[PDB]
Design a binder for this molecule. Structure first.
Ligand SMILES: *[C@@H]1O[C@H](CO)[C@@H](O[C@@H]2O[C@H](CO)[C@@H](O)[C@H](O)[C@H]2NC(C)=O)[C@H](O)[C@H]1NC(C)=O
Ligand SMILES: OC[C@H]1O[C@@H](O)[C@H](O)[C@@H](O)[C@@H]1O
Length: 246
């Protein structure tokens, strides 16, 4: 399991949690020196439990699919909650079985659907450690509309940060003051699958991508990534979604 406590949190303890999160995800190969997530894991071992603690010390446990870093659901006191999707329904067969009741959320977990539920795109939702503390607090009592925005915050500050070093740094910059994510941050989130695939295809194409990935950079500039020499590959991405899952 991994943990994170918002109480006394600072850019350092958060960095440590994101490092623990990455290290809990198993792999047997690296591709261009980036851990490659497994094609599949059977039964219970497919799911990592993140124990998160708000500023006052109340807690939820979030179940994470170790093969794609997708949040399946969470446990808040004696009630479990899972996205309305087959992958989550399957996870409910393994985690949080001892909850007194199980609620299916009225939405699945993808960004589009959560943004519909929440009533706004995530461009307009501040993120940061204080927002994570709010997220946690909200998920403590069922409210599907408020939960959608809380889950948007929670996915970005846990899974998207484990995936990209830049996004981890964005959150650390927002340790004591939330801010909406940069468009670069949005771009990386949206390109994770594409990048993971192009890095894997470069293995037999001499480090050249078969198809270029278009990103937005820090300065807000649109740019093409075409081979493994890019800073995105060499420094930024920390985890590759296996092409068997794309
Ligand atoms: C591999 O990617 C690099 C970019 O990371 C390409 O080099 C850049 O692209 C053009 C020049 O062709 C310039 O806009 C950049 O400033 C270049 N940057 C650097 C650091 O060289 C390179 O052309 C690509 N190689 C292949 C074979 O696709
Ligand atoms: O690429 C992975 C991401 O896909 C998004 O559409 C989902 O909303 C995220 O939960 C998931 O982590």
């Amino acid at each position: 399991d991994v943990s994170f406590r918002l109480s006394g949190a600072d850019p350092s303890s958060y960095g440590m949690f994101i490092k623990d999160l990455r290290n809990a995800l198993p792999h047997t190969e690296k591709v261009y020196n980036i851990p490659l997530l497994l094609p599949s894991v059977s039964g219970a071992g497919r799911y990592l439990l993140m124990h998160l603690f708000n500023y006052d010390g109340n807690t939820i446990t979030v179940a994470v699919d170790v093969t794609n870093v997708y949040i399946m659901g969470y446990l808040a006191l004696t009630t479990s909650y899972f996205f309305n999707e087959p992958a989550a329904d399957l996870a409910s067969q393994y985690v949080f079985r001892s909850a007194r009741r199980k609620i299916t959320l009225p939405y699945s977990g993808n960004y589009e659907r959560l943004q519909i539920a929440a009533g706004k795109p995530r461009e307009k939702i501040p993120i940061g450690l204080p927002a994570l503390d709010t997220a946690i607090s909200t998920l403590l009592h069922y409210d599907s509309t408020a939960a959608a925005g809380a889950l948007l915050v929670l996915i970005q500050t846990t899974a998207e940060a484990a995936r990209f070093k830049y996004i981890e740094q964005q959150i650390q910059e927002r340790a004591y003051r939330d801010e909406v994510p940069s468009s670069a941050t949005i771009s990386l989130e949206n390109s994770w699958s594409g990048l993971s695939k192009q890095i894997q295809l470069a293995q037999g194409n001499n480090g050249v991508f078969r198809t270029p990935t278009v990103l937005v950079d820090s300065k807000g500039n649109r740019v093409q990534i075409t081979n493994v020499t890019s800073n995105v590959v060499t420094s930024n991405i920390q985890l590759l979604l296996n092409t068997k899952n794309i």
